[PDB]
Amino acid sequence: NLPEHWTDMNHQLFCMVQLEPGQSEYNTIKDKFTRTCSSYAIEKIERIQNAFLWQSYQVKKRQMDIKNDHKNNERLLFHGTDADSVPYVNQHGFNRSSYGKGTYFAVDASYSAKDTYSKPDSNGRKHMYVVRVLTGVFTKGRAGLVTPPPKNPHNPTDLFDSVTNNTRSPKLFVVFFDNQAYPEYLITFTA
Amino acid sequence: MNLPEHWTDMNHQLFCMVQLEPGQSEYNTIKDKFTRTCSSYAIEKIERIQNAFLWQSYQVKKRQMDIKNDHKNNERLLFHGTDADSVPYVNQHGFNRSCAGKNAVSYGKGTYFAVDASYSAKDTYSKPDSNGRKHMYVVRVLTGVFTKGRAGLVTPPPKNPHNPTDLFDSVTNNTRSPKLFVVFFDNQAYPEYLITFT
Ligand SMILES: Cc1cccc2c(=O)nc(CSc3ncccn3)[nH]c12
């Protein structure tokens, strides 16, 4: 039940796999990066293969495509982070524990790349994820949120799937639930 | 879908509240576990929570936790007292540690479940509504391997500090005779019943 472009895992559950620079995979992901980051240089890109994380995101993808219509739920966003969170993110993905109390993802790589988010290690090396997020139906964000707003406040059961800063042209995305985002690649880059 | 064979036909709907008959095995059992520690109260009704999406995502982790842990009994049956305003979201969307109320003696920021119904029947947790009712959930909780908790936790503590990202599944007030349990992740507990009592 896994992605068929994944490396054999030798009967293991977690695996980090570095891309070969000439590949279409490397250039597809790199072309997405170089749209808004032409200045930076990539040390590497690695495909994160997490069986359990994959499994649970997959489950929600279907629960979402069910619930909306079959709307276009999924987006490719970026998550810059500091070198020390990475081991956890690789393993357990993103955790929520201002447009809300949740996990932030950038439409553009230039945004995530801000040293505020993608923090240089002692070696000047920064980090950013290319994350598949289940965005589905969203609305505008505000400071207070612990969960996305319910569509109709007179039915506080159905919720939006995320929140944006502006709905006409969103530049970020916030999700408030475990397993709504699968980190697909890890870009290590340099000034 | 995955749906259990004892569930009422939801006829193509994803969430259902179903009223149990007292005479039934299912109703009496639940009853007998409530009356172990709670006699002075009385049961108005017992509803089975039939939530597909919750049941589905929950089960996936029950399996991932049966694999990952060497032949352990990962799943435990506990109580959750809550209030009239918190029933609807939960029935629909389960438990959320970010909405979690603080505990008198706190062992971690997350959602607390009780071994005895008495503790959960405290008006502190199960608050009576304007009609005087009290509500408690009967939850399937994945406790797995657990250590003692501390008030500073956000996720469980790691098994080996030198191996940080490897964590316990939950934490208890006491490992010898646990009376409470704390879980730190979505889909780690199934709200299987809603007891409304007095
Ligand atoms: C922190 C804690 C310890 C032991 C039990 C509970 C509980 O049953 N419900 C809750 C939910 S918080 C709440 N919810 C509604 C009314 C009062 N408090 N918390 C517990």
Burial of B189 (0-12, 13-18, 19+ CB in 10 A): buried
Spell out which residues of chain B touch residue A9, defining contact as CB-CB under 8 Å: none
Please give the CATH architecture assigned to the domain spanning B1-198.
Alpha-Beta Complex (3.90)
CB A165 within 8 A of CB A139: no
Residue to probe by mutation, ligand 1, list B125, B137, B184, most atoms within 8 Å of CB: B125
- Alpha-carbon gap, residue B95 to B100, rounded angstroms: 8
- Alpha-carbon gap, residue A127 to A79, rounded angstroms: 8
- Alpha-carbon gap, residue A42 to B146, rounded angstroms: 41
Nearest to A87 among B88, B165, B186 (CB): B165
Any idea of the CA torsion for B88, B94, B96, B99, to the nearest 10 degrees? 20
CB A104 within 8 A of CB A79: yes
Which amino acid, B165?
Answer: T
Contacts of residue B183, defined as CB under 8 A and 6 or more positions apart, other chains included, come to B95, B97, B110, B111, B113, B141, B142, B143, B169, B170, B189
Task: State the nearest Cα–Cα gap between A62 and chain B, in angstroms.
Answer: 10
**Which H or E element spans position B57?**
helix B52-68
- Alpha-carbon gap, residue B102 to B108, rounded angstroms: 9
Q: Which two tokens stand for residue A76?
A: 């490719």
Please give the CATH architecture assigned to the domain spanning A1-191.
Alpha-Beta Complex (3.90)
Per DSSP, the residues of A18-49 read EPPTTSHHHHHHHHHHTTT-SSSEEEEEEEEE
Which amino acid, B11?
Answer: N
- Alpha-carbon gap, residue A101 to A148, rounded angstroms: 9
Residues for chain A: how many in total?
A: 191
What values do phi and psi take at A118, rounded to 5?
-75, 95
CA B104 → CA A94, A121, B175, B191, distances in Å?
Answer: 29, 40, 19, 23
A92 → chain B, closest CA residue: B165
**Comparing C-alpha atoms, which of A19, A46, A161, A49 is closest to residue A100?**
A161
**Comparing C-alpha atoms, which of A167, A178, A159, A185 is closest to residue A103?**
A178
CA A171 to chain centre: 14
- Alpha-carbon gap, residue A174 to A159, rounded angstroms: 13
B96 and A146 within 8 Å at the Cβ level: the answer is: yes
Residue B128: Cβ within 10 Å count: 14
Residue to probe by mutation, ligand 1, list B102, B112, B180, most atoms within 8 Å of CB: B112
Extended beta strands in B86-162, E state: 111-114, 134-142, 146-148, 158-160
CA B17 → CA A22, B45, B50, distances in Å?
Answer: 56, 12, 6
Question: Which value in Å is the resolution of this experimental model?
Answer: 2.4
- Alpha-carbon gap, residue B114 to B79, rounded angstroms: 5
B64 and A52 within 8 Å at the Cβ level: the answer is: yes
- Is any Cβ of chain A less than 8 angstroms from the Cβ of B109? yes
- Alpha-carbon gap, residue B80 to B175, rounded angstroms: 20
Please give the method by which this entry was determined.
X-ray
